[PDB]
Amino acid sequence: GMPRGA
Amino acid sequence: MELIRIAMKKDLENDNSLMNKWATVAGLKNPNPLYDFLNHDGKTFNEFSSIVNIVKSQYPDREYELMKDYCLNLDVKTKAARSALEYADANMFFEIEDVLIDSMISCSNMKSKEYGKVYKIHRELSNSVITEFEAVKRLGKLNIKTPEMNSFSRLLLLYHYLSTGNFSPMAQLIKQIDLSEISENMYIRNTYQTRVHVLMSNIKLNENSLEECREYSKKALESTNILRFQVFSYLTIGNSLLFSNYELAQENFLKGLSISVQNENYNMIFQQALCFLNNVWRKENKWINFESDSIMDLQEQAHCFINFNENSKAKEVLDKLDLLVHNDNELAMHYYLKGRLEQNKACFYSSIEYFKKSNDKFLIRLPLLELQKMGENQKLLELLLLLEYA
């Protein structure tokens, strides 16, 4: 998948 | 003495102009708190901003070692210790953070007690030690009084939503935050503000509002000197370009790589971002992790295999993924891959269902495009774009 973060 | 002030004094023995330069870097206006900070044990600056800025300017290569020693020797009842808890959490310095937390949960100052108990809920929820239900319940019983922990009780939910692929509650929750209510601790206010800028970038990305997503990440970058927030800004900017600008998306992920080379976790995240980028554009993919059984990495093995018409090897990998447990956003991606392998429209509708469930308006462009290629009625696609989930 696509990595996502904050 | 703490290692930080030992080094600051031995370095001021050799150069005296460092007094005026350190006072400017810390924002002090005159070295009076600097002199006091070096001459009596236990004296703290008014804003944690002061020590962090000197450490980053004068000893950048030694930040972690210096701040670990300085933070863990602070009076847990103080403002300085409460700022260090945020510094630690914002930097993902978990070993500083968890020591400070069990230390502040134990003390006798009520502000530090509160911070500790709320940051502990965030850490337990972060590690899937507790569910969201037991976190919300525990937060309620705390009767949180400070505006900082009222802001952070909501931030920690936002991070949990982002990480579990459950995006629909985030927009209304983030609107409840008012950081102008934070007036006692300018370092916590400024760092929470960076936190909100990066979370707003992710929410705008998840709404397919790509210009606004990039403006919010750019404001995070101008607002911060903390590596964790720069990493997630470059990550989110790059993600926003995935479907439109290969070279600029790659350039942002490579900039992210360049600033996180000594951090295995952040380095891995940019490899994964470059891995997805190259699969979206159906190019040769040198970023695949063939020694992993995470869903993220396995999905990209399958994607690349499908792109290069190696359908057997993609079937093997997708056989693996069936025997792992997916969340909503991961499942939507799983059905997208199944549809591309199978050439099966039903897989693409299940993909859409779960992007709708997760409220992901960005990655849904993948199954939508495949349906269009297979001749789906344009009016139907418009309708799917328009309807939403409960």
Numbering used by the authors:
A (entry chain D): 1 to 6
B (entry chain A): 1 to 390
Question: What's the paper's own text on this?
Answer:
The arbitrium system comprises three phage genes: (1) AimP, encoding the peptide that is processed into a 6 aa signaling peptide extracellularly, (2) AimR, encoding the intracellular receptor of AimP that is predicted to be structurally similar to RRNPP regulators, and (3) AimX, encoding a putative long non-coding DNA that functions as the negative regulator of lysogeny. As a transcription factor, AimR dimer induces expression of AimX, which promotes lytic cycle. The concentration of AimP will eventually reach the point that its uptake by newly infected bacteria will be high enough to bind AimR and abolish transcriptional activation of AimX, thereby shifting the phage into lysogenic cycle. As predicted from its similarity with RRNPP proteins, the structure of AimR is characterized by two domains, i.e., the N-terminal HTH DNA-binding domain (residues 1–73) and the C-terminal TPR domain (residues 79–386), which are connected by a short linker (residues 74–78).
The electron density of the N-terminus of AimR within the AimR-AimP complex was of better quality; using the structure of apo AimR as a model, the binary complex AimR-AimP was solved by molecular replacement and refined to 2.00 Å resolution. In the structure of AimR-AimP complex, two molecules of AimR are present in the asymmetric cell unit. One molecule of the AimP hexapeptide (GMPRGA) binds to one molecule AimR. The TPR domain of AimR forms a deep concave pocket that accommodates a molecule of AimP, with a buried interface area of 758.6 Å2. The C-terminus alanine of AimP is facing the interior of the pocket, whereas the N-terminal glycine is located at the entry point. In vitro ITC assay demonstrates that full-length AimR specifically binds AimP with a Kd of 40 nmol/L. The interaction between AimR and AimP includes an extensive network of hydrogen bonds and hydrophobic contacts. The oxygen atoms from the peptide backbone of AimR form hydrogen bonds with four AimP residues: Q299AimR and E300AimR interact with the nitrogen moiety of G1AimP, N239AimR forms hydrogen bonds with P3AimP, N202AimR interacts with G5AimP, and R228AimR contacts the oxygen moieties of A6AimP, whereas five hydrophobic residues from AimR (L205, L242, F276, F362 and L363) are involved in van der Waals interactions with the side chain of M2AimP. As opposed to the classical interaction between RRNPP and the signaling peptide in bacteria that does not include side chain-specific contacts, the guanidinium group of R4AimP forms hydrogen bonds with three residues in AimR, namely N206, N329 and D360. However, our structure indicates that in the spBeta-derived AimR-AimP complex AimRs still exist as a dimer.
